[PDB]
Amino acid sequence: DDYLWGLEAGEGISDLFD
Amino acid sequence: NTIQQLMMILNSASDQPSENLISYFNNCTVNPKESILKRVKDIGYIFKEKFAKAVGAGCVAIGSQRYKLGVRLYYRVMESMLKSEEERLSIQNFSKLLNDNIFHMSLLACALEVVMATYSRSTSQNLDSGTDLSFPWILNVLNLKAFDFYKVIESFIKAEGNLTREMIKHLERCEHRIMESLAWLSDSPLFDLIKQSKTREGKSTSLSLFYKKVYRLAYLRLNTLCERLLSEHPELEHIIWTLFQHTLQNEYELMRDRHLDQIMMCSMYGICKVKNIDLKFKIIVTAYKDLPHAVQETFKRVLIKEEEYDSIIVFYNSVFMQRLKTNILQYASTRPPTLSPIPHI
């Protein structure tokens, strides 16, 4: 599948919201 | 995993958050308990009424059911994420995250999109005509922006290991749609993030992540059009990719209210143009239709200046090429722009 798993090692959702 | 698996789990699940989720709330510096519960209830009157106005009062019970399962999915994934996060960085608090209304609106919206999409065709029954609430719909309902929503997709997917391949794909396509146009609309916070970056360095992982996925999607589509129209000239594409890549990054205003694919098609033409390779827009436009996104409106109705739209050819000549004239020519010059690395994996 073409989807790009963009989160590098250990990045989690917390690094996307304040 | 039995195409019914997650929905089975959801139908079995309790409406109230688990002892363990509540435990995460009690360890936050700011207790989010009341806010999450109220949000759930408030978004409920709003989702239920908008949904009912989409399918009709005879179908009021279905809106409630969509909502019920979506909230169960919401808590489920939320708990899943908090465990992954506690483990990921051994902390236990999470007040910063759990008190972020945007985070909570995106998890909910994403959860409602899953329940919504799995029962799509069923909901489509007793619906019909010009009222088919595809994906952006749920964003329209929660007054939530596409760029914010996109931030919860990869994580949401990695957090719910029971998503059907069919659900995984839909979520992925949703993110692609965001990347191709939704995230570049004038009401998109992406522009505040970009301008912030162009200005004061550091910060915004979400923008860096956004672009990583744009470039990857961008290249993929680009590469598909080249394999079809430019087999004779393999050196192109990488050059076309460079202009395309440089444009989204440094000429991002060209993307405002426009489509990823319009900049792509205009990049291919322009580069072939200076490199003395035929390639009429007529050709390009015809192959484009082979792309998963691909709709005619995208090259037939392109934003020119004011709310004035025209053919992608008008955009190319009046805006694109005029805006990038000298950059384009540098590709045919003695010292060609350094080629941009092709997005990988």
Swiss-Prot record, chain A:
Residues 1-18 are annotated as: Retinoblastoma protein binding. It is found in: Nucleus. Highest level of expression is found in placenta, low levels are found in lung. Found as well in many immortalized cell lines derived from tumor samples. It comes from the Eukaryota. Phosphorylated by CDK2 and cyclin A-CDK2 in the S-phase. Transcription activator that binds DNA cooperatively with DP proteins through the E2 recognition site, 5'-TTTC[CG]CGC-3' found in the promoter region of a number of genes whose products are involved in cell cycle regulation or in DNA replication. The DRTF1/E2F complex functions in the control of cell-cycle progression from g1 to s phase. E2F2 binds specifically to RB1 in a cell-cycle dependent manner. Component of the DRTF1/E2F transcription factor complex. Forms heterodimers with DP family members. The E2F2 complex binds specifically hypophosphorylated retinoblastoma protein RB1. During the cell cycle, RB1 becomes phosphorylated in mid-to-late G1 phase, detaches from the DRTF1/E2F complex, rendering E2F transcriptionally active. Viral oncoproteins, notably E1A, T-antigen and HPV E7, are capable of sequestering RB1, thus releasing the active complex. Binds EAPP. Belongs to the E2F/DP family. This is Transcription factor E2F2. It comes from Homo sapiens. The lineage of its organism: Eukaryota, Metazoa, Chordata, Craniata, Vertebrata.
